[PDB]
């Protein structure tokens, strides 16, 4: 019960073929390329500014998100116990 999204998604899974992305940026060639050069410069700037924020930003968060994942995990195993305890009781009852 979805729009166009479902038609191309089901076709991609049935055919077993992922849609091709931009295989351009990585290769390139020295000596149109004035644009390609200026795109590279800006890209690098973004990465570097972004990378710099990310290290410092990453450094600040590099482990703050890891703590959240431990709070998320322990909650699941508490429910594993709560389910374990009910079922055991039921089994015991049946046995008796």
């Amino acid at each position: 019960t979805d729009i166009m999204r479902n038609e191309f998604e089901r076709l991609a899974a049935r055919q077993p073929i992922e849609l091709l992305s931009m295989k351009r940026y990585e290769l390139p060639a020295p000596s149109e390329c004035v644009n390609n050069s200026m795109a590279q410069l800006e890209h690098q700037a973004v990465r570097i500014e972004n990378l710099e924020l990310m290290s410092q930003h990453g450094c600040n968060a590099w482990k703050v998100y890891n703590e959240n994942l431990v709070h998320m995990i322990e909650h699941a195993q508490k429910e594993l116990q709560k389910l374990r305890k009910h079922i055991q009781d039921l089994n015991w009852q049946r046995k008796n």
């Binding site: 973004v46 972004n50 703590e67 959240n68 994942l69 709070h71 998320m72 909650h75 508490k78 429910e79």
Partner: protein, 132 residues
């Protein structure tokens, strides 16, 4: 990860359904038995209204990572929304340079007519005086 009332790591988290915030069951239970209210917003809340944290149901999840499709899409917003501000830094600075260039080229065009007349007048004074 924290309990908002005490500030500890709660060992039995239960989320309220009036002010959405993760409280420790043993702490919030005593807060409700004191008076039937939510500690933050002071809205009415009972013990049955409070709900423990649970595994969703039957769909299995994975932790929040950079791979995950939704986290990758919200990443590309950050990319473009930051690059859009990068364009303002160059659009605003261009409107100062071209405005200073416009007044500079006007002062150049207003001045070079006076250089042309002094080159005329100082040579005309040399043409006049030398002949006499």
């Amino acid at each position: 990860l924290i309990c908002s009332i005490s500030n500890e790591v709660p060992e039995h988290p239960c989320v309220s359904p009036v002010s959405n915030h993760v409280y420790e069951r043993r702490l919030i239970e005593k807060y409700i038995a004191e008076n039937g209210t939510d500690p933050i917003n002071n809205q009415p809340l009972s013990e049955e209204q409070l709900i423990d944290i649970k595994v969703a149901h039957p769909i299995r999840p994975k932790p929040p990572s950079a791979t995950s499709i939704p986290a990758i899409l919200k990443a590309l917003q950050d990319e473009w929304d930051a690059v859009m501000l990068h364009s303002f830094t160059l659009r605003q600075q261009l409107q100062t340079t071209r405005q200073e260039l416009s007044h500079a080229l006007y002062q150049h065009d207003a001045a070079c007519r006076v250089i042309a007349r002094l080159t005329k007048e100082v040579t005309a004074a040399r043409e006049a005086l030398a002949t006499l």
